[PDB]
Design a protein around this ligand. Structure first.
Ligand SMILES: C[C@@H](NC(=O)c1cc(C(=O)N[C@@H](Cc2ccccc2)[C@H](O)[C@@H]2NC(C)(C)N(C)C2=O)cc(N(C)S(C)(=O)=O)c1)c1ccc(F)cc1
Length: 379
């Protein structure tokens, strides 16, 4: 219940729900920048040239400790891409661990639909493993450098508080960030933070899909992705069930596709008419699983108000994917997520800051009995 990690609490910020970022200071003399926390990629990169959406950027000529690697780097994402130049420099996180390391850094010189207007972040911290780093797995990711060069335990945890703030505890866990117990699911393979979903329920009702469909291709935990993205067949079945569950009100088809949004008079959003969604994850013991449950407050996201108006507009943030399940911010904002790399597992617990109402709350419950969970994974 105590807190030796107090200085790392509340070290994350967000602007109009456009990405959670932490301050990172690079080079010498110090150059501090706002960096997006992304567990869905593995490259540490910072804007290094003027751009319409950037307030500031990394100026390598001003850093005496900058070391040019003489190699270009290109990183394409689901949304956007950028080109840059590799090098290494001293990096520290003011509100993170009390250490300084020399890490690889990609200086972003050109980009397309990457930076987001008004987001206040100027770079990205890829927290996933080396296998997915660009140009290749020989480019050591920032966290790997942190663990190799210092005594910091191989583990970090994220509390993303939606509507924007949060905490990234590096090297441990802070008990003030969650309630109840922490439940762990294994990290299937160390590339993306891959996990295995064994069952899906909408308002306690089993979607009844073969679990292989839930992980077709893969299922990952990705703080760099806004939505809960699901494979085509899963998406369709989920929307069908969600619509049936919230039949007390009808919405245009475009709403469920994220193309149309619906607004309610400030403070009147009928959260109660929307169902809860539960994802069962493989547990750490044979045939044992647990489930995490989110509320409509997590999958219905606010859209930057017109100008402090009397209308709360929302977008349905569950969408389709062709590269597996992506448990993005809509999932993470309901919990305190522990990325226990040391023990190859990811923990989930109810977040002390998740958005809810006086009738329902996000939950993490278990254990449950689920047979043949191993077969749910894709090979
Ligand atoms: C900051 C912002 N991100 C987005 O608005 C975004 C980024 C990616 C993305 O590609 N994320 C990658 C990182 C990235 C790209 C561009 C800008 C910032 C960050 C991420 O690496 C992603 N992981 C996987 C492995 C899926 N992949 C291939 C990626 O590119 C995908 C989507 N979708 C397609 S969506 C509408 O959510 O279905 C949206 C955001 C806003 C609020 C949050 F609360 C958390 C993150």
């Amino acid at each position: 219940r105590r807190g030796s990690f107090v200085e790392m609490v509340d070290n994350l910020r967000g602007k109009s729900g456009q990405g959670y970022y932490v301050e990172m200071t690079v080079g010498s003399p110090p150059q501090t920048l706002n960096i997006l926390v992304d567990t869905g990629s593995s490259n540490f990169a910072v804007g290094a040239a003027p751009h319409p959406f950037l307030h500031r950027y990394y100026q390598r000529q001003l850093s005496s400790t900058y070391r040019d690697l003489r190699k270009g780097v290109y990183v394409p994402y689901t949304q956007g891409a950028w080109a840059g130049e590799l090098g290494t420099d001293l990096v520290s996180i003011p509100h993170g661990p009390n250490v300084t390391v020399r890490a690889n850094i990609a200086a972003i010189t050109e980009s397309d639909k990457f930076f987001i207007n008004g987001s206040n972040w100027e770079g990205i911290l890829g927290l996933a493993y080396a296998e997915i780093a660009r140009p290749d797995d020989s480019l050591e990711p920032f966290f790997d450098s942190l663990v190799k060069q210092t005594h910091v335990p191989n583990l970090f945890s994220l509390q993303l508080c939606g509507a924007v703030g949060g905490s990234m505890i590096i090297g441990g866990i802070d008990h003030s960030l969650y309630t109840g117990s922490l439940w762990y699911t294994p990290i299937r393979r160390e590339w993306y933070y891959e996990v295995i979903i064994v069952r899906v329920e909408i308002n306690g009702q089993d979607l009844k899909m073969d679990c292989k469909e839930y992980n077709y291709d893969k299922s990952i935990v990705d703080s760099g992705t806004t939505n809960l993205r699901l494979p085509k067949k899963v998406f369709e079945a989920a929307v069908k069930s969600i619509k049936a569950a919230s039949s007390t009100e009808k919405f245009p088809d475009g709403f469920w596709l994220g193309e149309q949004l619906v607004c309610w008079q400030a403070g009147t959003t009928p959260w109660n008419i929307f169902p809860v969604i539960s994802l069962y994850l493989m547990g750490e013991v044979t045939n044992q699983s647990f489930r995490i449950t989110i509320l409509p407050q997590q999958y219905l996201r606010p859209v930057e108000d017109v100008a402090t108006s009397q209308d709360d507009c929302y977008k349905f943030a569950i969408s389709q994917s062709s590269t597996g399940t992506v448990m993005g911010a809509v999932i993470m904002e309901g919990f305190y997520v522990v990325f226990d790399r040391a023990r190859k597992r990811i923990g989930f617990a109810v977040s002390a800051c998740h958005v809810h109402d006086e009738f329902r709350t996000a939950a993490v419950e278990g254990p449950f009995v689920t047979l043949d969970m191993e077969d749910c994974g894709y090979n």
